[PDB]
Design a protein around this nucleic acid. Structure first.
Ligand SMILES: [Mg+2]
Ligand SMILES: [Mg+2]
Ligand SMILES: [Mg+2]
Ligand SMILES: [Mg+2]
Ligand SMILES: [Mg+2]
Ligand SMILES: [Mg+2]
Ligand SMILES: [Mg+2]
Ligand SMILES: [Mg+2]
Ligand SMILES: [Mg+2]
Ligand SMILES: [Mg+2]
Ligand SMILES: [Mg+2]
Ligand SMILES: [Mg+2]
Ligand SMILES: [Mg+2]
Ligand SMILES: [Mg+2]
Ligand SMILES: [Mg+2]
Ligand SMILES: [Mg+2]
Ligand SMILES: [Mg+2]
Ligand SMILES: [Mg+2]
Ligand SMILES: [Mg+2]
Ligand SMILES: [Mg+2]
Ligand SMILES: [Mg+2]
Ligand SMILES: [Mg+2]
Ligand SMILES: [Mg+2]
Ligand SMILES: [Mg+2]
Ligand SMILES: [Mg+2]
Ligand SMILES: [Mg+2]
Ligand SMILES: [Mg+2]
Ligand SMILES: [Mg+2]
Ligand SMILES: [Mg+2]
Ligand SMILES: [Mg+2]
Ligand SMILES: [Mg+2]
Ligand SMILES: [Mg+2]
Ligand SMILES: [Mg+2]
Ligand SMILES: [Mg+2]
Ligand SMILES: [Mg+2]
Ligand SMILES: [Mg+2]
Ligand SMILES: [Mg+2]
Ligand SMILES: [Mg+2]
Ligand SMILES: [Mg+2]
Ligand SMILES: [Mg+2]
Ligand SMILES: [Mg+2]
Ligand SMILES: [Mg+2]
Ligand SMILES: [Mg+2]
Ligand SMILES: [Mg+2]
Ligand SMILES: [Mg+2]
Ligand SMILES: [Mg+2]
Ligand SMILES: [Mg+2]
Ligand SMILES: [Mg+2]
Ligand SMILES: [Mg+2]
Ligand SMILES: [Mg+2]
Ligand SMILES: [Mg+2]
Ligand SMILES: [Mg+2]
Lengths: 162, 193, 46
RNA sequence: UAAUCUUAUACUUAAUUCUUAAGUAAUAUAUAAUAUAUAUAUAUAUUAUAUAUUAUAAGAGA
RNA sequence: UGCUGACAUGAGUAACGAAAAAAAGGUAUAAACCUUUUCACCUAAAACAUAAGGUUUAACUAUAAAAGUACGGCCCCUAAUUAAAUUGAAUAUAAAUAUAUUUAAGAUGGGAUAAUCUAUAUUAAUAUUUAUCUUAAAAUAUAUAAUUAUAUUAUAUAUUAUAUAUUUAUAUAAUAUAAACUAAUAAAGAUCAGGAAAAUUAAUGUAUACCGUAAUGUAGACCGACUCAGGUAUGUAAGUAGAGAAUAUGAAGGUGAAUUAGAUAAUUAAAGGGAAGGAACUCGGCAAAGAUAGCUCAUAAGUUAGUCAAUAAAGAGUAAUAAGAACAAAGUUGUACAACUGUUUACUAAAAACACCGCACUUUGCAGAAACGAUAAGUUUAAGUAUAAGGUGUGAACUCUGCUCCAUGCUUAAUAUAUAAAUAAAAUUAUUUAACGAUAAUUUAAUUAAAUUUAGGUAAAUAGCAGCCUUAUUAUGAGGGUUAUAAUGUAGCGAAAUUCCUUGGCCU
RNA sequence: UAUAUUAAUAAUGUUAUGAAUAAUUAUUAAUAAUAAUAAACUAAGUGAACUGAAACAUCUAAGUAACUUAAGGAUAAGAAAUCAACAGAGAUAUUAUGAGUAUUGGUGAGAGAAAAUAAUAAAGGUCUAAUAAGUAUUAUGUGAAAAAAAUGUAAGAAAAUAGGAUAACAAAUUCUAAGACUAAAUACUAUUAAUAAGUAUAGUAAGUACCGUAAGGGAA
């Protein structure tokens, strides 16, 4: 039911069954869920999410206090209910929540100073060095030793400023 | 109708131009806009067209192109204006009075080729040139095809006048119920002439 | 009129509508390509 | 009518390009205060606070 | 009427598939293969070049030769169209997948240079189809700058003699058959209103890729079971003669056949002639025969005014007055049906049937009707807008289209009106607990539609348009009375393609 | 142009005008990509008709054929909101008795369990959840021939002092839904070995020849 993958259907699904006349004649019919396009508000994303959802999930969202709480329910039932689209959104909500709660500092400049020294060293021996390779090589280095340049400070990437 | 090579026509959908704007003392004050307001060829919003004027190329929305009375010799007449509701009643060539937004495009005059309807093709080939293929009557069909078909000799099968796919073709209104025109004052005269 | 001459040859049409790529580049074409292969046929397509 | 529905189109730190973030530039909206001009109200200017950098325009509308 | 294999009978019978051949020699081996000569057939082809196709069948393994300048493909560009391709979330959808936008592919098409032979790369800057009419003028013939008649209306390159940069190019002046035909601008008539896509300079540079190339290709070399009288695209297609690519011959070329040789019975097919009759034949002039110009004149009635009739029939002018190739050329009239040109049952019906231009009704106001969409997005309608589009019937035009909406529908107005679903609340009942309670059906409670009903309109919607008696002295009934219906057959036509009785009565 | 691009170098030529500079030859560092990859078994979606009923529509055929989708050597199921009856058993899968049994059907054609006892089976129980709500339940439309579990629309609780199970109620009994992993006995393919009151028209060719445009059919 690939139409469900594009929205939050809450596990809802199509049912194929029979229709019955007073003569008990049987003819096939389909039961389609009540799908409604609604634009809800996300507090952490600070923008209006707009996807097709069924009426039942919309009511469930109202009782759970917004889309953000709907997409962040631990109980397995919710995970199954949330389709591909819900999973990706959950990632957004959760990652953004972590970013706000966990700032990076509770190196970019250092690598900027280090780059000209290394490129000159590589050019001296006849080789070259581009920024993308510089990042790739020095991605995993925790501490850059002071071979050249001057550490005219006591930062240590801790307690910035006074 | 009367457009000829040499005449001058202008459009006033943006509004009154600068030339008249600086001539307001001698242009708007004497209200000699009527000289150009009701002129053959130029296009005005229905708001500025006086009541009773014969107009064509009538739109529906202010930001839309003309859609009505574009065919040969067709014309429409402006009936009433409702500034409060931003709608104007425009008598339309079918005879149906329809609401239209006040600031809707409208060109004054009838459309050219009045005598188009009096033309007559002389042979079947002529039609073929314009892209009209033959039409086979239902009576000549077979029963599997058009319902009227079948029966020995000439017979209509005591079947109502129906389209091939099973829709009455004699006085049956197709647009019925909820899916109807929300804007119309009076229906077009069904008997027409 | 006389019949029997229904097959009028043309390499372009014969290859375009019955060729290997004419079947390898479609779901239905691939299905019959693999059906012939499973049966062991030597000449999969034109 | 922010129910629905249709139509058209800058600097700086922290993680070459991308992203977050305190500050300020400029635009838009809303509130409070001050000053001016007309019949408590309308219009304009300044100061301050809050938000934005999918929208705008047209149409139907419970 | 069993399956497979082998072998019989029909039977050494039918047949060997449009047809011209003969002698000599290769070869004291030839009707069938090769060569020479004679004869003949095809010749706007059975010839010469090609396209597609194909077991290379070819003049063959030692085999089909390309920088380009008329050499095509390849390559650039696109049409119709195609695409498991591209666009927290392009749209839609049980899957399959569909839709819209991009991108890519796709010739049956477009692509500068060139015999005085030409140079495609890199870098940098900035055109539907269709005709050449009339006047004019020059020049020519009879007549006297006047008049009659006449080839020509524009280009296509050689020679002679002069002027320019200096025997290479241009220019000038004079000379030079007729009929067809070719590509380029010119000019201009009609509506049926006539494809898409990919720059110039300046410098530098070019060592010329791959594939096609034979022969057959109106056929023994492809599609047809066959070395099949069938089907198959393009350009030349000598002359003589003609309006002509008709018809006659045939220069050159090719060719004369997997059947031959004798008499040609009865009989069969395709042809030629036929006395005296001339449709008596026959369902029926089926078949066959019939041509007194092919050019120039002339050409009636009717009529929608259109030499439609009409190529009018008969007739005339040109040598023919007994005839001497082939082709073109085959009368007049009345009636029924249909306006006409056209379409149809590949392979028994080509028509009176379909279509048609014309007439008429009706739906749709564009966010539309109609159609398609396991079903939607969406597409055609249409880049159109009531003089447009869809459906229906009739079917050019002259004279006309009378009557009635009873029935089936359509359409307008009426809460006149029942009923399904959906709900609360509240009364009796039943089962059970001892009790409150729990569970069940029942009935009351205001809040409904479409539908149905009533009254209209709609027949160029589907449809219908009766019956008895007797009155002007002998006939009939102009007329009078009768039942019910919505109406009661009007104009016209009438033994109709409509009439069994019927070969209806009368006339030609 | 991966015999490639960028950068550097030694030289040549070489422009530019000693140095530079690219072009070339030759070295070194960096910059990059190759999908034919089976069939059967399993699970899921959709889902016929012929036929039987001596007609036919409920019913059957049958959730079968067929199409589509996804994964593994297997997959599915699995440690009770299970059965049973006042006494008790203790996950799952397959086979036998139970049993053609209860049950069901235009009460036609027909369809048809469970408990319990046996056999194969493996160490066969064990936490991975902060103990599960638009969930149970109700109304309604569907939904394995008896036996429910699911599902469209909408309404919608409780905390072990609670909740599920039976037309209903009272007692009693039993279990804990909305969180999970799980060998082996099983299916299919291939290989080795053993046994053939099996095969020489089920004894190796060939999916070839040939037929059809194609899917496809198919010899001696
Ligand atoms: Mg018929
Ligand atoms: Mg029908
Ligand atoms: Mg055949
Ligand atoms: Mg095709
Ligand atoms: Mg026998
Ligand atoms: Mg015999
Ligand atoms: Mg004989
Ligand atoms: Mg014989
Ligand atoms: Mg001899
Ligand atoms: Mg000829
Ligand atoms: Mg000739
Ligand atoms: Mg030839
Ligand atoms: Mg292309
Ligand atoms: Mg081409
Ligand atoms: Mg050739
Ligand atoms: Mg050749
Ligand atoms: Mg032949
Ligand atoms: Mg052949
Ligand atoms: Mg000759
Ligand atoms: Mg030949
Ligand atoms: Mg022969
Ligand atoms: Mg005779
Ligand atoms: Mg005689
Ligand atoms: Mg006779
Ligand atoms: Mg006789
Ligand atoms: Mg005859
Ligand atoms: Mg006359
Ligand atoms: Mg003739
Ligand atoms: Mg008559
Ligand atoms: Mg006719
Ligand atoms: Mg005809
Ligand atoms: Mg026929
Ligand atoms: Mg015939
Ligand atoms: Mg017409
Ligand atoms: Mg429609
Ligand atoms: Mg019309
Ligand atoms: Mg007719
Ligand atoms: Mg008429
Ligand atoms: Mg008629
Ligand atoms: Mg009438
Ligand atoms: Mg009710
Ligand atoms: Mg039966
Ligand atoms: Mg069943
Ligand atoms: Mg299944
Ligand atoms: Mg498992
Ligand atoms: Mg499991
Ligand atoms: Mg059992
Ligand atoms: Mg629990
Ligand atoms: Mg239920
Ligand atoms: Mg069963
Ligand atoms: Mg549990
Ligand atoms: Mg064949």
């Amino acid at each position: 039911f690939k139409q469900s993958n594009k929205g939050l259907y809450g596990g809802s699904f199509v049912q194929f069954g029979n229709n019955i006349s007073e003569s008990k004649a049987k003819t096939r019919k389909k039961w389609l869920p009540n799908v409604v396009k609604k634009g809800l508000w996300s507090e952490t994303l600070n923008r209006k999410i707009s996807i097709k959802m069924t009426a039942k999930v919309l009511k469930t969202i109202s009782k759970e206090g917004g889309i953000d709480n709907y997409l962040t329910k631990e109980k397995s039932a919710r995970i199954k209910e949330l389709g591909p689209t819900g999973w990706k959104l959950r990632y957004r909500v959760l990652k953004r929540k972590d970013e706000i709660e966990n700032p990076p500092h509770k190196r970019r400049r250092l690598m900027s100073f280090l780059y000209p020294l290394e490129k000159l060293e590589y050019r001296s021996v006849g080789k070259d060095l581009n920024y993308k390779k510089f990042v790739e090589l020095f991605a995993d280095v925790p501490v850059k030793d002071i071979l050249a340049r001057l550490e005219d400070h006591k930062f240590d990437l801790s307690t910035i400023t006074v | 109708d009367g457009l000829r090579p040499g005449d001058v026509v202008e459009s006033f959908r943006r509004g009154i131009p600068q030339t008249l704007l600086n001539e307001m003392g001698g242009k708007v004050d004497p209200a000699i806009l009527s000289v150009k307001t009701t002129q053959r060829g130029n296009c005005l919003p229905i708001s500025m067209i006086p009541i009773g004027t014969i107009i064509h190329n009538v739109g529906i929305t202010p930001v839309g192109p003309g859609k009505f009375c574009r065919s040969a010799g067709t014309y429409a007449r402006v009936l009433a204006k409702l500034p409060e509701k931003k709608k104007a009643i425009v008598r339309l060539q079918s005879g149906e009075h329809r609401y239209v937004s006040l600031e809707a495009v409208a060109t004054i005059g009838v459309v050219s080729n009045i005598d188009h309807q009096n033309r007559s093709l002389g042979k079947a080939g002529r039609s073929r040139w314009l892209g009209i293929r033959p039409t086979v009557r239902g009576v000549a069909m077979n029963k599997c095809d058009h319902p009227h078909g079948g029966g020995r000799g000439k017979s209509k099968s005591n079947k109502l006048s129906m389209s091939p796919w099973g829709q009455l073709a004699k006085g049956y209104k197709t647009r019925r119920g909820k899916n109807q025109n929300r804007m119309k004052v009076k229906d077009r005269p069904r008997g027409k002439d | 009129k006389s019949r029997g001459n229904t097959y009028q040859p043309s390499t372009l049409k014969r290859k375009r509508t019955f060729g290997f790529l004419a079947r390898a580049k479609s779901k239905q074409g691939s299905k019959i390509l693999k059906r012939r292969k499973l049966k062991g046929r030597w000449f999969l397509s034109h």
